[PDB]
Amino acid sequence: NEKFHQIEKEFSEVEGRIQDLEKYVEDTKIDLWSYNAELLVALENQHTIDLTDSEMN
Amino acid sequence: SGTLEFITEGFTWTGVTQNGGSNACKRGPGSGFFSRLNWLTKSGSTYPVLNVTMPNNDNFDKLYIWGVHHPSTNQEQTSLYVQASGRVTVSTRRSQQTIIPNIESRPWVRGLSSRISIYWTIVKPGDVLVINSNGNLIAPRGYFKMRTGKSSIMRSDAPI
Amino acid sequence: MPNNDNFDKLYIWGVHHPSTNQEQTSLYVQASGRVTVSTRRSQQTIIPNIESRP
Amino acid sequence: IDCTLIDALLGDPHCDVFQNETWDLFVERSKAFSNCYPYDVPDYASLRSLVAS
Numbered sequence: 113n114e115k116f117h118q119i120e121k122e123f124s125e126v127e128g129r130i131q132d133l134e135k136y137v138e139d140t141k142i143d144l145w146s147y148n149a150e151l152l153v154a155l156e157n158q159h160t161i162d163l164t165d166s167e168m169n
Numbered sequence: 170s171g172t173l174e175f176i177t178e179g180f181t182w183t184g185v186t187q188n189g190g191s192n193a194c195k196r197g198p199g200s201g202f203f204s205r206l207n208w209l210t211k212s213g214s215t216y217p218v219l220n221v222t223m224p225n226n227d228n229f230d231k232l233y234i235w236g237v238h239h240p241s242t243n244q245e246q247t248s249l250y251v252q253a254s255g256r257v258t259v260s261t262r263r264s265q266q267t268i269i270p271n272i273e274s275r276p277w278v279r280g281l282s283s284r285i286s287i288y289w290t291i292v293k294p295g296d297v298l299v300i301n302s303n304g305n306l307i308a309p310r311g312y313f314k315m316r317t318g319k320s321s322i323m324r325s326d327a328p329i
Numbered sequence: 330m331p332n333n334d335n336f337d338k339l340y341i342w343g344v345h346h347p348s349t350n351q352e353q354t355s356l357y358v359q360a361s362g363r364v365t366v367s368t369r370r371s372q373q374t375i376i377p378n379i380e381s382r383p
Numbered sequence: 384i385d386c387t388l389i390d391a392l393l394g395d396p397h398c399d400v401f402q403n404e405t406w407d408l409f410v411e412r413s414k415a416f417s418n419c420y421p422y423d424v425p426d427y428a429s430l431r432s433l434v435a436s
């Protein structure tokens with residue numbers, strides 16, 4: 113995951129419409145990646161527990 | 170763009186005094202100014218209508234930084250530019266920017282009530298830059314070479 | 330020009346920007362023109378630039 | 384063909400064929416060019432977007 117120039121994510125002044133949109137985009141991205149990270153480790157651990165139980169059987 | 174590469178160009182400003190300085194911007198012991206900007210004032214008793222063109226014969230984009238001076242009194246306006254009202258127009262074949270200076274007394278910073286507004290203009294290859302000024306022009310001295318790439322900027326107080 | 334229809338109208342208009350004072354006065358006479366287009370909720374006021382452009 | 388959507392909106396003579404036209408998708412070509420009075424549209428992208436929509 114290699115990113116360079118992006119958008120500003122911290123703001124020192126109240127601006128309104130454009131800043132509301134920049135904040136909303138980043139908050140949307142973070143919530144979606146946070147969901148992906150949570151679901152991934154859940155599916156992974158369930159599968160790891162199953163495959164190690166399977167080897168014993 | 171990732172660079173501050175500046176190339177000085179041969180602008181000819183006929184009829185005006187160049188390299189204006191200010192004690193709010195000392196360089197060394199004496200007064201100075203922004204190194205990349207050129208503060209033009211009257212020469213003798215006249216400030217002519219400047220009309221300069223600078224074509225781009227290169228294969229890259231040129232970035233031009235320029236400005237307009239906002240005096241604080243009518244006395245400062247006439248004693249610098251003769252004309253009671255200045256005007257700065259910077260255009261290309263596809264854009265124009267006209268700025269009328271405001272003459273107002275603003276809060277004092279470094280002993281100054283006056284101000285400068287900064288503007289910019291990108292000139293594509295094959296296009297030309299045209300500057301037309303009746304007064305109050307803070308002229309460019311050249312262009313910055315523009316690039317595309319992986320460069321960016323960050324706010325941080327972390328040590329390197 | 331009132332809008333007495335039940336739909337929105339899109340108007341396209343413009344402002345001419347001469348290159349010389351003689352071109353300005355030989356066309357519009359006035360030394361400096363002005364174009365103002367307005368509705369009850371908007372106003373667009375434009376002063377033409379007399380400039381010699383590329 | 385030779386016309387941009389804004390040129391056909393304004394009525395550039397070589398775009399007269401596009402008067403009163405409709406479309407689901409308007410296709411602009413690289414070869415397009417203007418051949419009328421030199422003009423400038425502040426917020427060109429927005430006028431192009433709302434006409435195209």
Ligand SMILES: *[C@@H]1O[C@H](CO)[C@@H](O)[C@H](O)[C@H]1NC(C)=O
Pocket residue numbers: 174175176177
């Ligand atoms: C900027 O860089 C060029 C090429 O790297 C160099 O030749 C020139 O002296 C520099 N110009 C200025 C104004 O610093």
Ligand SMILES: *[C@@H]1O[C@H](CO)[C@@H](O)[C@H](O)[C@H]1NC(C)=O
Pocket residue numbers: 220221222299381382383
């Ligand atoms: C000012 O410069 C423009 C751009 O080249 C040119 O067309 C025009 O004739 C010039 N006007 C005068 C008075 O030199």
